[model samples]
Target: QDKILILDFGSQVTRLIARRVREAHVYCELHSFDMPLDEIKAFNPKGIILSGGPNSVYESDYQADTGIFDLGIPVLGICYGMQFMAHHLGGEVQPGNQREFGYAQVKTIDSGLTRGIQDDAPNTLDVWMSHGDKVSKLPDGFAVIGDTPSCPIAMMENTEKQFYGIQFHPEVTHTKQGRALLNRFVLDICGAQPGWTMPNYIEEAVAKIREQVGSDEVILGLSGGVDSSVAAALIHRAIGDQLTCVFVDHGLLRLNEGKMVMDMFARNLGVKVIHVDAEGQFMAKLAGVTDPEKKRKIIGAEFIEVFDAEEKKLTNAKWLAQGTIYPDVIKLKLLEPLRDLFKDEVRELGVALGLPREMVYRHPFPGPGLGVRILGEVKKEYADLLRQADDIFIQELRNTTDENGTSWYDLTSQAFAVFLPVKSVGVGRTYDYVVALRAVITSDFMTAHWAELPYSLLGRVSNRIINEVKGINRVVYDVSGKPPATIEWE
Candidate 1:
């Protein structure tokens, strides 16, 4: 892929660059600063972004590779990168008396890099800053474009070579116009056009896959969600007939989901798929399992075992593709790809890979299917009952339109309810069954808020869950955001 390659130097803000690029609808990649020049050569990125690091330029014997700048492609020097650029080009960077950290108001900022934003209104951009070293001077041909109260140069640009650098992180929503500023640098300033898109991403991935694995067969666990579907599609495109997808229908999907998904991917997309109805096994293990984490462990372990057995079925298969999404990585506390990329960005990545916009931007769903939805008190038979009410809720949510006609007011994400077995005292002088509704509105899974769905929507969702979903008697909304609350009830 012709991506925006970022060289990571251990910056807390390093991932932000990838986030910004993905948000700009551009594809990008990252490697440690210790990466060899040979590896960088292998990527062939349109631009090289040097991430800010914890170390300063003045540290004794503090030497790093200076060859990144010579690439002649567009180079964006961030805080540390800017200082490095200045030092490389004969500018001055020295230790500062005080480290600047957190929430600084801009005194005078050059607006051109900000993409038509006119702060001519005085003090237009406010930002977060953390640095122990400051660039006191600049290299020749570089103009100080923006600044804060403490630092005289917040931004620097070399129009001649189309090089741009920023002291503040635009990747964070903390900095206003951050994504736009990056867009200006990458597209408007550097002239890297928009020909790179999702469809192109798909084509590139396909081509890359073919080149890497011409005939090596692969096994994939296909969940009928956006992430796995796209992954399966790309792999299939790369090595057709060499890809085998196995989907475990644990008898725990939304209404008609297993059949619908199986037919769609296996029949429509034309991939070899094995649909396993492992109802007895899943229920046997899940029986008397009320704790959330235990349920997850059983599901995960059983899934791996099932997948392994299926993989063994494929003679000489070398890889196991998963329906992993960006959110799943974060949930597992693993290092996520493009951590800064939000939910909307995956859509762009999907577009860049040529997936339909809806497919790219669709919300998240669990791999365990609706099994997790049945909480402390759940039975196999009740799943059929819960589906009826949940079906009405899901359908209504799909139909509810907003003023923008976007049913997704904050629907930029995914959410669902957990059908718990707990019972609560009811208003009708009766003990009632209860379920927890967990719907989060999020971009990246790192920070999120519970969707502020209107009362009407909640009422409708709750009513159906309570009345239609046979095993549930009560539904409660989860108001907590990501900081204190997780999106899932289990």
Candidate 2:
């Protein structure tokens, strides 16, 4: 596969390591540090990268399969990974002179790994450092390639063995020309060619799926979400009728979402879709349950029952599939933020996949669906009204676009309506419920800012909900940011 292999030592940013290599048009796979040497060899990597982690290499429990050094390929290590390399190869790693947690400048010595990475300043480059341990001595035949004040052996290379180690992370964006350093290693030092793409991935995935499941029917849980839809489309393209999609429509979905999902997968794509309408059953179980956790339990358990029943009905299907990429194929998740990726970017991938525009550009909805959007309670009346109000809010966002010809819907990271269980006074001396509009901007969902949507846009959304929908009396915008409030109400 002409791939670079990444040995993950439990770094949360392990994906970024692989992502950087992939960005260079060189394919890579990230596996645990304990992956067998034979399996690592089977991947036939031209280069290897050891990812940084939180563990101290001096500890006995922090050991990994160090047999990779014998493979006669290029190797790059970062942070704790660098310590592991030095400590294992008869070198020294101490606690630290000082912890270099952020920005620092490294003096680069001319070497194969650091070739052409320096800017106008000769032998000097800016880097990001996040390590507490420093390599105090060099292993035999290894020379320092770069160094910082806090970290002496910031970068090292054993040219004779094609092995390289760096204290700082080149995969992180903060490190200027970080990707350039990685590209130099993967392409220039490792001599690996740039030859990976999405189309190639799709072809390989189809072949692998066909080889794994000869004639057996594969069942996939098809949610209309981007992940599952892409999975369904990919697997269906692989095995045609050999794949069956079991879509469980829990009552919590947005208006017509279930129909849109079924039509796309079944009618448009010609895949076998078993639409399980468990809304009535789910609502019945959730009836009068106001506690979010309690209602959550009922909804989760009911869907399992529904899917189990449908699986029994389809005795022919042998394998069950999920809406995950290759890495995740190796892990709701709903409390899970969409990996902090923008909603518009996810839609771009969907649009590129040729999915219907309606499905591609739909507002981001939660996994628990309307259950979480509705305040503390679960009821048919609140849910029905919530759906209408939410639809109104979404429609207006789509109806208006910003200066760049992008709709306000596409601009906001997440926008939805939360139905208040309490009612407020309405026109004509009537009393009805209230709806709160929430929209936020965030890169990784870890922290977020509530989007400062124009008052005119907000006004239009409010007017439409109160005038068009009968039950909703008042509409309010949630100005709360991630500091005081989370994206979802419940």
Best by lDDT: 2
Off by over 4 Å in 2: 89-91, 97-100, 107-127, 140-143, 327-353, 357-365, 396-413, 426-430, 441-449, 452-459, 479-485
Assess the local accuracy of residue 163 in candidate 2 as a C-alpha lDDT between 0 and 100: 81
Candidate 1 stretches with Cα past 4 Å from truth are 1-3, 38-45, 60-63, 71-73, 94-101, 107-115, 119-123, 158-162, 211-217, 237-242, 316-361, 409-412, 425-430, 443-445
All models: lDDT?
A: 0.68, 0.78
- Mark the 10 consecutive residues where model 1 has the least summed lDDT: 330-339
Per-candidate total of colliding backbone pairs: 13, 0
**Which lDDT tens digits does candidate 2 get at residues 1-490?**
5788888887667777777787787877778888898998888889888988877788747667888888988888888788889988878998752244788899998888786678568778788887578789998779999988877899998889988888888887778878898899898888888876555556666677778777888777766677677667767877899888889888788888888898888899899998888778878888777888887677777777787788777777677776545444330011111222233334544565568877866655666788888888687778888889988888888888889989888888889999997889976498988999999886532677988888999998999899888888899999999977888987
Model 1 TM-score on a 0 to 1 scale: 0.83
Note each model's CA RMSD in angstroms.
Answer: 4.7, 4.8
